[PDB]
């Protein structure tokens, strides 16, 4: 039954051509398979991608946009103009070429990048991947995208329309397990989002739970607020939605549990994956998405801090048990 030319078995031929983009990345763009920044960098692609896509406009007789669609490559010049799409243009060069020697759409390269990118970073969830998607695309509107400076009620708007519950909203935010800011703060270059930024944990959610009482760099930078300890930076956005009663229980019932996170992470990335497009018109290659390795750290509050500097949010639910350290507090070195 299907045997791809490398020998690799597969359960569709459509599947096969994605082992040869999958070398290509893991040696070339990934520079050997690493979880640094073209992982990071591509998650904001798939995200900025996927998320020009307004039932709302289209509603109003308006061009929506085309959901995953690819067209933040195809269409680059407008997209890389748009004020949340700063710092990509490198990626997104390095994307276009694979794309073009590999005759694959953008839409399913950026899908599958982010799948692949993932599972070089311990603690991940083999994403799903579907191919398929149309090469064709029309430039997103601007405005789709949400920007750290926003309220919780114009993020929830903005991600609602395009398909997503206030849950949603914050399982999405996993991904920032694995980030950093380049440009909010440029002072303070790639300082991360929190304590493992090549690790796929819980810490993200934890740690902005934490009473700010650092400023990690000479100034604060745009949208930014006072974090739990030196290194590390925390976005206004994260900040407010951790705290928020719409987000504040899902906030805190992601912060014990890696296996409970990183299913809602692929369930809502499954999701946006096809925004814009029928998932039953599309054909299923999960199988080539290789594991990763797994993480064996338990959830912690970090350098003695306990639960008494976690601003509990969530009325209803107590605080999970989580372990402590007798540590003194963090100095965060940027991520890689
Ligand atoms: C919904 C609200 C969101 C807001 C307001 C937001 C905002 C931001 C901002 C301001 C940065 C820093 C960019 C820079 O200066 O370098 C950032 C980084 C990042 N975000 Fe988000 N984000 C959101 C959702 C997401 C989602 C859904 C994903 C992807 C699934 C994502 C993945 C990341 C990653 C991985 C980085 C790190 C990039 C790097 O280290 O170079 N974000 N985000
Ligand atoms: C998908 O569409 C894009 C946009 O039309 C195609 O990209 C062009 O590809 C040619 C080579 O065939 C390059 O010289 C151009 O520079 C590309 N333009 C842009 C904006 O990237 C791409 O080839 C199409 N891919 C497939 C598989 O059809
Ligand atoms: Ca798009
Ligand atoms: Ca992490
Ligand atoms: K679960």
Same mark, same amino acid.
Not at 106 to 135: H, K, W, Y
């Given at each position: 039954?299907?045997?791809?030319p490398?020998? #690799?078995s597969?359960?569709?031929?459509?599947?096969?051509?994605?082992f040869?983009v999958?070398?290509?990345?893991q040696?070339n763009?990934?520079?050997?398979?690493?979880?640094?920044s073209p992982?990071?960098?591509?998650? !904001?692609?798939?995200?900025?991608?996927?998320?020009?896509?307004?039932?709302?406009? +289209?509603?109003?007789? #308006?061009?929506?946009?085309?959901?995953?669609?690819?067209?933040?490559?195809?269409?680059?010049?407008?997209?890389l103009?748009?004020?949340?799409?700063?710092?990509? +243009?490198?990626?997104?060069?390095?994307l !276009?070429?694979?794309g073009?020697?590999?005759?694959?759409?953008?839409?399913?390269?950026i899908?599958?990048? +982010?799948?692949?990118?993932?599972?070089?970073?311990?603690?991940?969830?083999?994403?799903?991947?579907?191919?398929?998607?149309?090469?064709?695309?029309?430039?997103?509107?601007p405005?789709?995208?949400?920007?750290?400076?926003?309220?919780?009620?114009?993020?929830?708007?903005?991600?609602?329309?395009?398909?997503?519950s206030? &849950?949603?909203?914050?399982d999405?935010?996993?991904?920032?397990?694995?980030a950093?800011?380049?440009?909010?703060?440029?002072?303070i270059?790639?300082?991360?989002?929190?304590?493992?930024?090549?690790v796929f &944990?819980?810490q993200?959610?934890?740690?902005?739970?934490?009473?700010?009482?650092? #400023?990690?760099?000479?100034?604060?930078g745009?949208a930014?607020?006072?974090?739990?300890?030196?290194?590390?930076?925390?976005? !206004?956005?994260?900040a407010?939605?951790?705290?928020?009663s !719409?987000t504040?229980?899902?906030? #805190?019932?992601?912060?014990?549990?890696?296996?409970?996170?990183?299913?809602?992470?692929?369930?809502?990335?499954?999701?946006?994956?096809v925004?814009?497009?029928?998932?039953?018109?599309? +054909?299923?290659?999960?199988?080539?998405?290789?594991?990763?390795?797994?993480?064996?750290?338990?959830?912690?509050?970090?350098?003695?801090?306990?639960?008494?500097?976690?601003?509990?949010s969530?009325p209803?639910?107590?605080?999970?048990?989580?372990?402590?350290?007798?540590?003194?507090?963090?100095?965060?070195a940027?991520?890689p």
């Amino acid at each position: 039954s299907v045997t791809c030319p490398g020998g #690799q078995s597969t359960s569709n031929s459509q599947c096969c051509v994605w082992f040869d983009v999958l070398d290509d990345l893991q040696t070339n763009f990934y520079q050997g398979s690493k979880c640094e920044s073209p992982v990071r960098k591509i998650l !904001r692609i798939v995200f900025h991608d996927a998320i020009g896509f307004s039932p709302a406009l +289209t509603a109003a007789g #308006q061009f929506g946009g085309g959901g995953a669609d690819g067209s933040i490559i195809a269409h680059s010049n407008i997209e890389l103009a748009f004020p949340a799409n700063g710092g990509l +243009t490198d990626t997104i060069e390095a994307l !276009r070429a694979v794309g073009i020697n590999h005759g694959v759409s953008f839409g399913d390269l950026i899908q599958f990048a +982010t799948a692949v990118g993932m599972s070089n970073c311990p603690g991940s969830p083999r994403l799903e991947f579907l191919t398929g998607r149309s090469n064709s695309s029309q430039p997103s509107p601007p405005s789709l995208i949400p920007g750290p400076g926003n309220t919780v009620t114009a993020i929830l708007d903005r991600m609602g329309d395009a398909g997503f519950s206030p &849950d949603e909203v914050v399982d999405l935010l996993a991904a920032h397990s694995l980030a950093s800011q380049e440009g909010l703060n440029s002072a303070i270059f790639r300082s991360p989002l929190d304590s493992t930024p090549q690790v796929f &944990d819980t810490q993200f959610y934890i740690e902005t739970l934490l009473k700010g009482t650092t #400023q990690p760099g000479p100034s604060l930078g745009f949208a930014e607020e006072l974090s739990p300890f030196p290194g590390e930076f925390r976005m !206004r956005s994260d900040a407010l939605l951790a705290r928020d009663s !719409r987000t504040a229980c899902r906030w #805190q019932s992601m912060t014990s549990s890696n296996e409970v996170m990183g299913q809602r992470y692929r369930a809502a990335m499954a999701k946006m994956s096809v925004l814009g497009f029928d998932r039953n018109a599309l +054909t299923d290659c999960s199988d080539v998405i290789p594991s990763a390795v797994s993480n064996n750290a338990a959830p912690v509050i970090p350098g003695g801090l306990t639960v008494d500097d976690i601003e509990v949010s969530c009325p209803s639910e107590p605080f999970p048990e989580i372990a402590t350290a007798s540590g003194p507090l963090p100095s965060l070195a940027p991520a890689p």
